[PDB]
Design a protein around this ligand. Structure first.
Ligand SMILES: CCCCCCCC/C=C/CCCCCCCC(=O)O[C@@H](COC(=O)CCCCCCCCCCCCCCC)COP(=O)([O-])OCC[N+](C)(C)C
Ligand SMILES: CCCCCCCC/C=C/CCCCCCCC(=O)O[C@@H](COC(=O)CCCCCCCCCCCCCCC)COP(=O)([O-])OCC[N+](C)(C)C
Ligand SMILES: CCCCCCCCCCCC(=O)OC[C@H](COP(=O)(O)OCC[N+](C)(C)C)OC(=O)CCCCCCCCCCC
Ligand SMILES: CCCCCCCCCCCC(=O)OC[C@H](COP(=O)(O)OCC[N+](C)(C)C)OC(=O)CCCCCCCCCCC
Ligand SMILES: CCCCCCCCCCCC(=O)OC[C@H](COP(=O)(O)OCC[N+](C)(C)C)OC(=O)CCCCCCCCCCC
Ligand SMILES: CCCCCCCCCCCC(=O)OC[C@H](COP(=O)(O)OCC[N+](C)(C)C)OC(=O)CCCCCCCCCCC
Lengths: 80, 80
């Protein structure tokens, strides 16, 4: 959560032309909150960020989904 | 559900300056409904409440998520 939170957050450029737009993954704690809400399954996944690399953003975000929604949570049920 | 419902609800101060704003966790039954919808996975988690302690609010809300979304539901699948 914290590794991909800081990576995704540091990938986003300046806030906006008006300081508040599509800055979901703006800072660290805001990106950590967005990833937490993808694990719970709440909200709406929005990839149209003010990002310099949309492909690298999708790669890190989909890797996070594969590592937690698929591997870690189902492996928790199996070990339990 | 009811323990954290009444705790989170009693943490929120007066309704608003207009009696209706960001009062998701306003009263008891409204906070119980919001927690129920986090368990089902519906809605959108909004922590920007008219709260006096945003940190204590996150602590109680994340503890609820750890106790039900992680422990209790997966342990239900294991015992079943
Ligand atoms: C499958 C999942 C399982 C669960 C996984 C959970 C993983 C964790 C997920 C956590 C991510 C949640 C979001 C964090 C960031 C939100 C923003 C925020 O509030 O920032 C603040 C910090 O806020 C905190 O420090 C959050 C509260 C404490 C940490 C969380 C609980 C710790 C775990 C408890 C466990 C208890 C266990 C039981 C114990 C008996 C900082 O804000 P600021 O920079 O000061 O703002 C300045 C500007 N402003 C003042 C105008 C605003
Ligand atoms: C993983 C999860 C699993 C499920 C967990 C579920 C846990 C439970 C979750 C419950 C939380 C749901 C929300 C409750 C509060 C909503 C608000 C509300 O209506 O308030 C009202 C009460 O409302 C009730 O009393 C709700 C209905 C009855 C209880 C729920 C069903 C009982 C379980 C059945 C089981 C059957 C089993 C099978 C039997 C064969 C009160 O409103 P008011 O104060 O009078 O309003 C005044 C102002 N106004 C009139 C203008 C409005
Ligand atoms: C054990 C606890 C588990 C639960 C999670 C608790 C922490 C949640 C996030 C809190 C953030 C906060 O509040 O501060 C985080 C602070 C400052 O944040 P900021 O950049 O000013 O953004 C604030 C944005 N606002 C104003 C909108 C709120 O440091 C940082 O940004 C540094 C980030 C890089 C260092 C950390 C990397 C960690 C890697 C993994 C190590 C294991
Ligand atoms: C299927 C396996 C995928 C592995 C992951 C790759 C990253 C995802 C794609 C993003 C592409 C992009 O946006 O940039 C990727 C950039 C290069 O970009 P560029 O070629 O200079 O320009 C691209 C745009 N052009 C051509 C129009 C100008 O990478 C690098 O600097 C090197 C990264 C190497 C990573 C090796 C280790 C990977 C570990 C996992
Ligand atoms: C066994 C049944 C399971 C399913 C759940 C059923 C109940 C759901 C909620 C109904 C609420 C309601 O309707 O009344 C709850 C009432 C009055 O509510 P109010 O504060 O006026 O808010 C009404 C808000 N409105 C107007 C928007 C609807 O008491 C209370 O607030 C007292 C709360 C503290 C005492 C109870 C604590 C319980 C702790 C756990 C014990 C095991
Ligand atoms: C990692 C383990 C966390 C345990 C849970 C702690 C609560 C979460 C953080 C909220 C902080 C806050 O907002 O307030 C917490 C308040 C104290 O606040 P303060 O120091 O007076 O002011 C803070 C703001 N200042 C410094 C800028 C003025 O707590 C108390 O009165 C004592 C609570 C003790 C709890 C011990 C048992 C815990 C069981 C679990």
């Amino acid at each position: 959560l914290l590794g991909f939170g800081v990576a995704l957050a540091s990938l986003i450029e300046k806030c906006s032309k008006d300081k508040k737009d599509c800055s979901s993954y703006g800072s660290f704690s805001d990106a950590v909150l967005e990833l937490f809400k993808l694990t719970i399954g709440l909200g709406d996944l929005n990839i149209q960020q003010n990002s310099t690399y949309p492909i690298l953003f999708l790669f890190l975000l989909i890797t996070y989904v594969i590592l937690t929604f698929v591997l870690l949570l189902n492996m928790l049920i199996a070990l339990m």
